[PDB]
Amino acid sequence: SPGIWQLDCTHLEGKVILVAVHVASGYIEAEVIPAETGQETAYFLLKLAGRWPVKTVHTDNGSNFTSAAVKAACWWAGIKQMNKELKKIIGQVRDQAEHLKTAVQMAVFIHNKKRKYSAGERIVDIIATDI
Amino acid sequence: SPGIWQLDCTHLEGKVILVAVHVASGYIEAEVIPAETGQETAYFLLKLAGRWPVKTVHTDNGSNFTSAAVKAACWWAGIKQMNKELKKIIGQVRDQAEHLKTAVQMAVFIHNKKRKYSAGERIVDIIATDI
Ligand SMILES: [Mg+2]
Ligand SMILES: [Mg+2]
Structure with a gap:
């Protein structure tokens, strides 16, 4: 979905x-x-x-979604209830940037633009089709 | 484009x-x-x-893009060289949130989901079509 x-x-x-x-x-x-x-x-x-039409969200740590702040945001936005490779791509690019946060965004960019259709093309295609 | x-x-x-x-x-x-x-x-x-296929960026303040940090990010990502109403939507929602930053994201959400086709649907449609 x-x-x-x-x-x-x-x-x-x-x-x-x-x-x-x-x-x-x-x-x-x-x-x-x-x-x-x-x-x-x-x-x-x-x-x-x-940004995107978010209907449902899953997590591997259920307690992540327990706070009043989280429940309040999900309520208002109408929302209902890679980590290893991203860390590889981050390892590769780490030297090119001072701060980790920049390396993270470079790794996101690389992951989304990689064809092996890219993920960034697939998301847009799946969402447009569903409109 | x-x-x-x-x-x-x-x-x-x-x-x-x-x-x-x-x-x-x-x-x-x-x-x-x-x-x-x-x-x-x-x-x-x-x-x-x-996140999106960014080719070119414009600004109303050219000096915004002068720093080495900006030029370095544009170089790496391959990038080449509302503000009044958003502030209205922000005025409307301001009380519902403590921090300005949350009010800002609520205003972005409202602006992108408003049909009057929404902007969030149009962006996805324009990008998918161009693939
Ligand atoms: Mg977790
Ligand atoms: Mg400006």
């Missing part, structure tokens, strides 16, 4: 990377956050939902 | 909001930033470019 996304946090260099995967396409978006918190997850969800 | 975007900063409550508009569709993305700086603009561009 085109409205399904998966959301998890990974850890790297004492930092937290939030990663959302559009399940059908393989397209990702990520952010480096300071803390793994409800407030950061809510904010991220709100951004994601203004 | 589907690869054209416009990028500007506006000011609100002592804070900076970066706003990118996909010119053909009217779709926007925004972030609240602390400082109007080259480093924040570069980072934003890198995020935007991993």
Whole structure:
């Protein structure tokens, strides 16, 4: 289904990377956050939902979605209830950037633009078709 | 052309909001930033470019794109060289959220989901067609 996304946090260099995967396409978006918190997850969800038609979200850690901030964002946006390779692509590009956050976005870019149709093409195609 | 975007900063409550508009569709993305700086603009561009096929970017303030950080991000991503109404939608929703940044994302969401075909549908349709 085109409205399904998966959301998890990974850890790297004492930092937290939030990663959302559009399940059908393989397209990702990520952010480096300071803390793994409800407030950061809510904010991220709100951004994601203004951009794509987000219907449902899954996670591998259920307690991620327990905070009032998260429930409030899901309620308002109408939302209902790669991490290893991204880390490889990040390893590759790490030297090219000072800050981890920039390396993360370079890795997202590479992952989404790689044909092997790319994930960024697949997401747009799946969403347009569903309109 | 589907690869054209416009990028500007506006000011609100002592804070900076970066706003990118996909010119053909009217779709926007925004972030609240602390400082109007080259480093924040570069980072934003890198995020935007991993997500959509960004070919060219325009701004109303040319000096925005002068920093080495910006030029380096445009170089790497292969990029070449609403603000009033968004502020209205933000005024409307301001009370519903504590922090300006959340109000901003609510306003982006509203702007992109409004049919009056929405901007979020138009962007996906224009990009898919161009593939
Ligand atoms: Mg997790
Ligand atoms: Mg400006």
